[PDB]
TrEMBL record, chain B:
Similarity-based family: Belongs to the parvoviridae capsid protein family.
Shown segment, full-protein numbering: 219 to 322 of 735
Cell location: Virion
Protein name (database record): Capsid protein VP1
Organism: Adeno-associated virus
């Protein structure tokens, strides 16, 4: 209902966790499990690549279509670009339906 | 390969083969972090003169420019080329970055 491609076998979930590292266990033995660990985090790059297939547009309509066009009027901030403080902002939602096929 | 093995050797030399001269130069660079790792647009402050307005972006990236001559030619190598030759043009270059070390 939200949108997109209903799949029976979606791209599988990728779960990730830091392996816990204990911290300074006492010398004498105790059965209770460790309540204290090293405080640590991890970081690194992630690379996702998807190969899309397209349906080429083949039509005979005479007059020109509607297209998605960023307006040419001068403004304080360009759309879809960083501002002066570095905060990237998307100005408006972009639907996918512009080209026109006859019903 | 590894942390212990060095990636490249210092090459700074100028050899005059005959028609062609091959000039090599090596330097050590240091790259800070610009804009705290984020893009920013920049523009002319308030207003000053109609001619001086500008609009543009400032990226965190940084770049190498060897575009000046004296990078490649020592004053003496310049003197040889200049006194003994009518003309010179470049042919091909090769660029190398090595021994990178990051410090926190």
């Amino acid at each position: 209902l939200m949108g997109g491609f209903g799949l029976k076998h979606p791209p599988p979930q990728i779960l990730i966790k830091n392996t816990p590292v204990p911290a300074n266990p006492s010398t004498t033995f105790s059965a209770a499990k460790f309540a204290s660990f090293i405080t640590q985090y991890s970081t690194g790059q992630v690379s996702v690549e998807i190969e899309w297939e397209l349906q080429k547009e083949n039509s005979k309509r005479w007059n020109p279509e509607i297209q998605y066009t960023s307006n040419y009027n001068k403004s304080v901030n360009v759309d879809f670009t960083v501002d002066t403080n570095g905060v990237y902002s998307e100005p408006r939602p972009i639907g996918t339906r512009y080209l026109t096929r006859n019903l | 390969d590894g942390v212990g093995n060095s990636s490249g050797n210092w090459h700074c030399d100028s050899t005059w083969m005959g028609d062609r001269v091959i000039t090599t130069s090596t330097r050590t660079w240091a790259l800070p972090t610009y804009n705290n790792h984020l893009y920013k647009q920049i523009s002319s402050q308030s207003g000053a003169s109609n001619d001086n307005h500008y609009f543009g972006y400032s990226t965190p990236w940084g770049y190498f420019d060897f575009n000046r001559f004296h990078c490649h030619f020592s004053p003496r190598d310049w003197q040889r080329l200049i006194n003994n030759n009518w003309g010179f043009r470049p042919k091909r270059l090769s660029f190398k970055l090595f021994n990178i070390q990051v410090k926190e």
